Design a protein around this ligand. Structure first.
Ligand SMILES: NC(=O)C1=CN([C@@H]2O[C@H](COP(=O)(O)OP(=O)(O)OC[C@H]3O[C@@H](n4cnc5c(N)ncnc54)[C@H](O)[C@@H]3O)[C@H](O)[C@H]2O)C=CC1
Length: 501
């Protein structure tokens, strides 16, 4: 019978699991110190950072950097319950062409749901044991005005925390960070490093400024200590981590004998480039495959955003329009493989910085492999979700750079056009599909207004810049792609964007 994942059952689970299951054999609980407090325990934290810590704890004698999980959003209460019932153990299900593997992760040692007791969180982040506060809080959690590079202290969530009435009971990430820091300052400790693990460009610089700004509005003698003694390292983070379904959990119990309330599903690939900027110590990340660098991070990040997330966009919107269900189905198609490879090689690669010791061609081969992975079953709707937050960061910046340098960009325009068509919510066989996007109603109105001309969608100033509305080559190119996709669909149009034979 499948066993509930907890400490009591761990050895039975590994005994019954044999070659299919790995368990942590290091000591947990009171035996370790929680040097990392992580805000926003979701899939990617538990597939990426938590796994690196797991490996440090299992193989390298690191016992002062276990993870206290912290959830600030109302949905995080479910993570508290899942982990609590399992002694904060949880299963990482790695899916690859090689099969599936259940790696039980033990690096998460405790969990605080902040709305329960907010003082316990502050006392946690202030305790000398805490050396690093890491974040996976999504773009929206940073309260970041991208265009003015400033804290959205106009946001009522910030004002609530800025209000001295809420000093002891903050709500946002920065309210908890500041509340923890001032105690450390008053006690004479160092600032903990704040280690953003979200996928945005220069995530460390943003976090520095947000917490710096918030601090300047409440006490500049602490903001000054944050700005001088704090650390906010930039990082490139990479590991594809879909959401877990009830079917994933059933398959886990039947195939590996493990009853897990919230296992995590991921690919075997992982990558982490972080700059060596830490204010109160760090474990030796480089012993478990982490690239610790000194500018270098920004180049790795641009490689990832433009070729990985860009190619995801190339697979997602055209894949959905063509009738596919999963990433690997799209990538298996010969036309898509040629289209995606040539887009990477001919259109994105010339825009990227050369990183010493990195071969971009080899990185493209590896992305193709990863996308090809048929076991991970990555649903196209997940890739395509909230496209108005994705196309302008993964695809449009390459189009804009190709405008400024007059570079080739037909395939990039095809992807942009395919999303402009995706907005109407009807695939090439005439079947509706759900469009999920915070801007759906404005996007669908302008798309219906524009027909097959792109100018109505392009008129959305919050999404697209002047360079796009005013480049004649771009206007003609994306017009051709939109007309052709709208008339003939994706599969019949793709041959025209694929050279060679
Ligand atoms: N394949 C993947 O899932 C990848 C994810 N990432 C990064 O991880 C982050 C989240 O990814 P997932 O773990 O897959 O999503 P998730 O849905 O599993 O969890 C995200 C976490 O963010 C919290 N959160 C959301 N808004 C918040 C806010 N305003 N304040 C505090 N916490 C907030 C949630 O409660 C949750 O704990 C970023 O979205 C992404 O850049 C990076 C590489 C790939």
């Amino acid at each position: 019978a499948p066993l509930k994942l907890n400490s009591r059952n761990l050895s039975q689970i590994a005994a019954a699991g044999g070659a299919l299951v790995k368990i942590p054999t290091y000591q947990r609980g009171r035996a370790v110190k929680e040097g990392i407090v992580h805000i926003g325990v979701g899939g990617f934290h538990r597939a990426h950072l938590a796994v690196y810590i797991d490996q440090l704890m299992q193989k390298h004698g690191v016992n002062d950097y276990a993870i206290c999980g912290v959830g600030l959003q109302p949905f995080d209460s479910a993570m508290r319950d899942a982990l609590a019932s399992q002694d904060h153990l949880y299963t990482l299900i790695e899916r690859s062409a090689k099969g599936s593997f259940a790696h039980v992760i033990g690096s998460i040692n405790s969990y605080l749901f902040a709305p329960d007791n907010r003082e316990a969180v502050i006392a946690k982040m202030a305790h000398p044991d805490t050396k690093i506060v890491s974040l996976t809080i999504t773009e929206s959690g940073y309260y970041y005005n991208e265009n003015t590079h400033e804290l959205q202290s106009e946001h009522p969530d910030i004002q609530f925390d800025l209000d001295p009435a809420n000093e002891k009971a903050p709500r946002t990430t920065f309210g908890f960070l500041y509340a923890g820091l001032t105690r450390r300052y008053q006690q004479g400790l160092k600032p903990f490093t704040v280690m953003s693990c979200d996928n945005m460009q220069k995530n460390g610089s943003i976090t520095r400024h947000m917490l710096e700004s918030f601090a300047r509005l409440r006490n500049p003698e602490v903001a000054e200590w944050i700005a001088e003694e704090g650390a906010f390292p930039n990082a490139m983070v990479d590991r594809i981590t879909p959401q877990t379904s009830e079917t994933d959990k059933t398959a886990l119990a039947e195939k590996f004998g493990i009853v897990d309330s919230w296992p995590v599903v991921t690919e075997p690939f992982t990558q982490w480039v972080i700059e060596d900027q830490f204010s109160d110590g760090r474990p030796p990340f480089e012993k478990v495959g982490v690239q610790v660098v000194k500018h270098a991070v920004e180049q790795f990040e641009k490689h990832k955003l433009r070729l990985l997330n860009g190619s995801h966009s190339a697979l997602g919107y055209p894949g959905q329009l063509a009738g596919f269900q999963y990433v690997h189905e799209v990538m298996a198609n010969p036309l898509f493989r040629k289209f995606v490879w040539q887009m990477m090689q001919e259109e994105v690669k010339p825009l990227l910085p050369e990183i010493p010791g990195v071969d971009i061609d080899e990185y493209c081969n590896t992305l193709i492999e990863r996308f090809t992975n048929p076991t991970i079953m990555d649903q196209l709707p997940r890739i395509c979700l909230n496209a108005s937050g994705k196309i302008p960061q993964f695809i449009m910046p390459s189009i804009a750079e190709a405008i400024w340098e007059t570079g080739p960009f037909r395939r990039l325009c095809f992807v942009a056009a395919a999303w402009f068509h995706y907005i109407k919510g009807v695939d090439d066989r005439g079947k509706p599909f759900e469009v999920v996007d915070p801007m759906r109603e404005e996007l669908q109105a302008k798309a219906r207004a524009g027909g097959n001309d792109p100018s109505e969608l392009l008129s959305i100033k919050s999404l697209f810049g002047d360079d796009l509305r005013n480049d004649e080559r771009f206007l003609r190119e994306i017009t051709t792609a939109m007309n052709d996709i709208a008339r003939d669909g994706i599969m019949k149009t793709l041959p025209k964007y694929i050279n060679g034979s």
